[PDB]
């Protein structure tokens, strides 16, 4: 009888290696610990959020420091059109001499990593110009993380412990997070843009020492009180004005021109200044307002699923809006970072959206009470749960029968020497919406292509001022604002719609069927995560609500895989000026295979040939490294446990009978990985290998050509 794990004392009596693995897995599951009370529960959640908040602060200080120390931030401000951003310096003893000459890139003397996160682009528009300004930010975030780790320990002391009623009072929680956390901190960020980021974009150095002297406006705050707010909309930065100098700049601070900067292809900072200003006013007035509420407040897993659903929606919202509307200077010109930034947040948004349904499914086993919850919206969705799954079983099967057959049609027909016979459906619905938003390329001629429509004219109060800026961007084919789509873009969006419907189908299958079916009626008596109910009743493998999460992680990786293959290959012809490659080849699945996976992975895969090596050989290594770890998950997925338990029962024998090693004895009896355990182990190697392989391919196929 050992001590570890302290959480589960029933795991401590386990004398096998399962105790070691299940101690790592039942670790941060705080509802499962022995002797826990709900008053003690929420305080451990509260302090763990402080520990997590410091990690985000320590991570950002590391990104600020290693650009300040080992980067080229000052060299990149003077010329962002040729200089590649440096992430950190490389110091590995395993390198050769010909490799240090190949990784001493961006003109540096030491092996450095060319950055693809674009925090250079983010900090350049927040106002920073010098390497010392980034270091002061890294120093400051070490103070905030110290403030986070102190306050987490502080709010576990017996005099500073928050009460249970302080935790379950959500009425004052929403008033303060929309009010203070969302409203004032958007009003505070409005103070950063007008004081600092706007004059730093016009050649004026505004730092902590001199910002009390200089004012953001030549008529500062004297017309804010008499109501004459229109004087902040004076002469702005013209089309002549290059970013970061006084070459034809302006004095306006809150303008609503719309459109992009004519040289950096980014937003005007006066737009972002007036943006977060109005976001602050809406969130401030939204915070002065405060049997289902007894369910959402009681259930910790309910609010976590809704939070991951809210996070997962707004994370896709970032990636969809950041590439078409670039908010950062010279981020549109950095093709590799723009590609890496879309693919970053979309893969996280899939993980957040899968985890939303996952934690709602845990709520239905643990926290849901059908005798208390009756006749509300929740106990009605359970009441016709067969109607929701089967109608999700149709739209999954309706699209997948047809958009596959639409591909196999176009494959077979193109293969037979007759490309002129393909079923090419022009996406007229979305091409209407671009023509509704103003794209006059197609020629639909209603709604903001209609120059005499009431929306473009706005006959009430002569409002339409932001439409001159917007309509010079969507109509011009120099950026990614409302990309020109054709029939190849039709077929992928229905593959995408197949993926979002199928991943929802699996996730709401195990959500609604977490409490029982005709197979296992008592699935709430066995918990959220358990392997099976045996070989009886036909055999019940992967039956649980945990294993319905587990099958949908393959589907989100495939759906984001369909998504980001389409993002990358569409932009690989947009950036290269040859849009016709996605035009003809994307309609059939061989051009998706030959002209994207085969054609673009050539310069990656010559990262190390027998004649030399390049700076892509770290990506060509991590490419193959990602193939190997992905394929290893298959081993835990295909092969199952009792093969290996009868393989260890012979390795236990051969260890107990081998002299000079018979003497060395284990303390944990070696067992095979459990059933639920190697589903996770196989999915982890699958999911890491899915992501590591693309991130090596997406970077090296774009850095070789731009």
């Amino acid at each position: 009888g050992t001590k570890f794990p302290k959480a589960s004392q029933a795991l401590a009596q386990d004398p096998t290696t399962r105790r070691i693995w299940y101690g790592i897995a039942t670790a941060n599951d705080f509802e499962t610990n022995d002797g826990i009370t709900e008053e003690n529960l929420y305080q451990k959640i509260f302090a763990s959020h402080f520990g997590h908040l410091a990690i985000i602060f320590l991570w950002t200080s590391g990104n600020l420091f290693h650009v300040a120390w080992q980067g080229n931030f000052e060299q990149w401000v003077k010329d962002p059109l040729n200089t590649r951003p440096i992430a950190h310096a490389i110091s590995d003893p395993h390198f050769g001499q010909r490799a240090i000459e190949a990784f001493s890139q961006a003109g540096a003397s030491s092996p450095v990593n060319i950055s693809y996160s674009g925090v250079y682009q983010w900090w350049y528009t927040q106002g920073m110009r010098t390497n010392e300004e980034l270091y002061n930010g890294a120093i400051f975030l070490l103070i905030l993380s110290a403030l986070s780790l102190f306050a987490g320990w502080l709010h576990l002391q017996p005099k500073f412990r928050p009460n249970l009623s302080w935790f379950k009072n959500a009425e004052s929680r929403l008033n303060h997070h929309l009010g203070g956390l969302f409203g004032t901190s958007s009003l505070a960020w409005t103070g950063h843009i007008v004081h600092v980021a706007i004059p730093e974009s016009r050649g004026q150095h505004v730092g902590w020492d001199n910002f009390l002297q200089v004012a953001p406006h030549p008529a500062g705050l004297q017309p804010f009180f008499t109501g004459n707010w229109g004087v902040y909309t004076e002469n702005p930065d013209t089309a002549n004005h290059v970013f970061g100098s006084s070459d034809g700049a302006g004095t306006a601070i809150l303008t609503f021109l719309g459109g992009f900067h004519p040289q950096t292809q980014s937003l005007w900072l006066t737009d972002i200044a007036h943006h977060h200003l109005a976001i602050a006013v809406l969130f401030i007035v939204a915070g002065h307002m405060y049997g289902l509420y007894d369910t959402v407040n009681n259930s910790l897993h309910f609010q976590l699923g809704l939070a991951l659903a809210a996070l997962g929606v707004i994370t896709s919202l970032v990636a969809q809006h950041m590439y078409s509307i670039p908010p950062y200077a010279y981020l549109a010109r950095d093709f590799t970072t723009q590609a890496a930034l879309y693919t970053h947040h979309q893969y996280i948004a899939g993980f957040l959206m899968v985890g939303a349904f996952a934690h709602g499914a845990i709520f239905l086993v643990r926290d849901y009470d059908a005798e208390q919850n009756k006749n509300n919206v929740l106990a009605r969705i359970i009441d016709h749960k067969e109607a929701i799954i089967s109608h999700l079983s149709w739209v999954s099967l309706f699209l997948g029968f047809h958009t596959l057959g639409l591909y196999v049609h176009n494959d077979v027909v193109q293969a037979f020497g007759t490309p002129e016979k393909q079923i090419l459906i022009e996406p007229v619905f979305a091409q209407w919406i671009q023509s509704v938003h103003g794209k006059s390329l197609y020629g639909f001629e209603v709604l903001l292509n209609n120059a005499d429509s009431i929306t473009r004219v706005a006959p009430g109060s002569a409002q339409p001022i932001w439409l001159p800026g917007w309509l010079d961007a969507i109509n011009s084919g120099n950026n990614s604002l409302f990309l020109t789509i054709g029939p190849g873009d039709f077929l992928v969006h229905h593959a995408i719609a197949l993926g979002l419907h199928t991943t929802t189908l699996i996730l709401v299958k195990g959500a609604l069927d977490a409490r029982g079916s005709k197979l296992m009626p008592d699935k709430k008596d066995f918990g959220y995560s358990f392997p099976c109910d045996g070989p009886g009743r036909g055999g019940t493998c992967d039956i649980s609500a945990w294993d319905a999460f587990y099958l949908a992680v393959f589907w989100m990786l495939n759906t984001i895989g369909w998504t980001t293959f389409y993002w990358h290959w569409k932009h690989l012809g947009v950036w290269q000026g040859n849009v016709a490659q996605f035009n003809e080849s994307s309609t059939y699945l061989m051009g998706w295979f030959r002209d994207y996976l085969w054609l673009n992975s050539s310069q990656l895969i010559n990262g190390y040939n027998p004649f030399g090596m390049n700076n892509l050989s770290v990506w060509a290594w991590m490419f193959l490294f990602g193939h190997l770890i992905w394929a290893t998950g298959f081993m835990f997925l295909i092969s199952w446990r009792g093969y290996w338990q009868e393989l260890i029962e012979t390795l236990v024998w051969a260890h107990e009978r081998t002299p000079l090693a018979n003497l060395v004895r284990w303390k944990d009896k070696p067992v095979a990985l459990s059933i639920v355990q190697a589903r996770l182990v196989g999915l982890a190697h699958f999911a890491v290998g899915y992501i590591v392989t693309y991130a090596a391919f997406l970077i090296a196929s774009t850095a070789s050509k731009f």
């Binding site: 050992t2 110091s91 303390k667």
Partner: peptide, 30 residues
Amino acid sequence: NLPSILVPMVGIVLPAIVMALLFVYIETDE
């Protein structure tokens, strides 16, 4: 010069220390 000292410290030495306290914390008993 500070890269040449720090990266074999947390690449080799510091994992070997935290592996030691964990392996003793695992296999100890009350």
